[PDB]
Amino acid sequence: GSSGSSGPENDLDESQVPDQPSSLHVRPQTNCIIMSWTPPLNPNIVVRGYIIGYGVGSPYAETVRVDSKQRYYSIERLESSSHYVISLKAFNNAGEGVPLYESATTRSITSGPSSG
Numbered sequence: 083g084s085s086g087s088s089g090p091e092n093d094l095d096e097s098q099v100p101d102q103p104s105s106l107h108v109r110p111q112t113n114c115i116i117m118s119w120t121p122p123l124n125p126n127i128v129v130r131g132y133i134i135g136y137g138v139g140s141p142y143a144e145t146v147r148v149d150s151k152q153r154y155y156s157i158e159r160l161e162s163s164s165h166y167v168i169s170l171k172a173f174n175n176a177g178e179g180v181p182l183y184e185s186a187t188t189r190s191i192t193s194g195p196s197s198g
């Protein structure tokens with residue numbers, strides 16, 4: 083946020099859902115995948131958290147609702163050499179807002195980054 087926003091909804095807009103994170107970085111690891119997003123360009127909006135929807139081929143394989151404080155989530159217990167679609171979206175008393183999609187293909191344990 084800004085100016086250390088500590089406290090309940092004072093001069094924000096909860097009636098409306100939180101917009102997507104200005105940006106969502108995701109790094110597909112061997113058996114894990116770390117992701118770091120940011121708050122809505124509009125600090126005047128209420129944010130109860132974010133819905134982390136990741137999954138192999140489809141971001142609807144595993145969902146994880148975190149707090150509005152979590153700026154990043156490390157997805158572990160994943161496979162290697164597979165596409166992992168990550169979809170992060172902000173949620174609040176109003177519900178869910180413009181969901182943000184992403185892509186992250188895990189790594190490969192066995193040596194060999196590419197054929198060529």
